[PDB]
Amino acid sequence: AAEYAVVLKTLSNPFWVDMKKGIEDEAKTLGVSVDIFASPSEGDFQSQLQLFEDLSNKNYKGIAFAPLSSVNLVMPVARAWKKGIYLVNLDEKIDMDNLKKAGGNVEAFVTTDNVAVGAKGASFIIDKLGAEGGEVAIIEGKAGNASGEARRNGATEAFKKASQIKLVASQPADWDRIKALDVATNVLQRNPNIKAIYCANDTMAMGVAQAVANAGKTGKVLVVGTDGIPEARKMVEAGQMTATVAQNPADIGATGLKLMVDAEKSGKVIPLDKAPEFKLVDSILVTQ
Ligand SMILES: OC[C@H]1O[C@@H](O)[C@H](O)[C@H](O)[C@@H]1O
Numbered sequence: 001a002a003e004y005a006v007v008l009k010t011l012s013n014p015f016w017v018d019m020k021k022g023i024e025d026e027a028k029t030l031g032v033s034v035d036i037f038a039s040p041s042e043g044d045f046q047s048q049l050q051l052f053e054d055l056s057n058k059n060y061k062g063i064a065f066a067p068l069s070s071v072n073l074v075m076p077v078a079r080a081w082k083k084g085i086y087l088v089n090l091d092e093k094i095d096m097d098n099l100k101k102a103g104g105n106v107e108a109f110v111t112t113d114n115v116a117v118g119a120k121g122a123s124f125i126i127d128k129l130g131a132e133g134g135e136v137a138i139i140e141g142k143a144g145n146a147s148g149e150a151r152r153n154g155a156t157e158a159f160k161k162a163s164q165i166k167l168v169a170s171q172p173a174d175w176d177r178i179k180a181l182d183v184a185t186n187v188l189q190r191n192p193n194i195k196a197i198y199c200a201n202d203t204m205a206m207g208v209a210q211a212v213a214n215a216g217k218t219g220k221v222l223v224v225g226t227d228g229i230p231e232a233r234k235m236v237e238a239g240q241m242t243a244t245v246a247q248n249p250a251d252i253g254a255t256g257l258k259l260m261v262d263a264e265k266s267g268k269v270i271p272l273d274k275a276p277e278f279k280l281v282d283s284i285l286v287t288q
């Protein structure tokens with residue numbers, strides 16, 4: 001096997017496509033051989049565990065990964081840490097209590113500050129709704145995923161500080177476009193006076209926009225996404241989405257690879273009771 005392996009969520013989402021490119025570019029800068037893989041879809045928890053196990057069973061020196069769920073890679077990651085594989089968690093926080101209970105750790109975790117992402121999206125909505133405020137909803141990612149949970153907490157905490165805002169719904173749409181359209185339809189049905197919906201990612205935000213359109217409410221219901229994927233940036237320019245909190249997956253990926261290579265130079269994996277190296281990549285609100 002090459003020196004390093006990378007496990008991304010799914011290349012069917014531009015966020016992960018850009019993270020692969022960032023890693024590829026960084027690999028050339030560092031001089032390292034990297035094999036980059038991804039599961040076929042967001043719901044492939046089991047096959048991602050198998051993918052991780054297959055790479056962990058090869059002799060890569062390090063494996064950088066973004067788990068599809070907080071817990072689906074706890075067991076294989078613990079196993080890999082025990083084998084002395086230098087592990088870096090990209091983007092989506094593996095459940096660290098669960099991992100410590102399974103006897104492993106990760107050298108580092110590189111991600112966006114996801115609480116700030118949800119606070120930016122909510123703060124923008126609050127601003128746009130102005131003095132009168134109104135009812136708002138959050139369309140979360142997969143419940144329990146650290147990335148979505150942080151965005152949810154950041155947005156919820158911001159909305160709770162603004163009394164003119166009424167959070168009427170907070171539901172998971174599992175990073176899925178179809179599911180988000182369905183969840184937004186139901187939310188719009190139950191609370192037809194809703195004025196804005198923060199979505200924990202662009203894949204979901206796009207489907208939420210279609211629900212809003214079906215309801216004859218485009219522009220009357222703000223829709224804010226997260227990631228800054230190409231189609232969502234286009235929708236934001238065209239008024240189909242109000243805004244998106246853009247991330248820089250290329251730098252998450254490059255920075256994670258660099259942390260992994262750096263860790264390998266130490267010659268031992270991180271101790272179980274040492275906090276992983278932590279690095280945050282900025283986000284930025286993208287509006288019309
Ligand atoms: O794969 C779904 C999503 O996972 C999150 O952890 C990433 O930060 C991006 O929001 C991505 O779109």
Ligand SMILES: [Zn+2]
Binds near residue numbers: 001002059
């Ligand atoms: Zn080899």
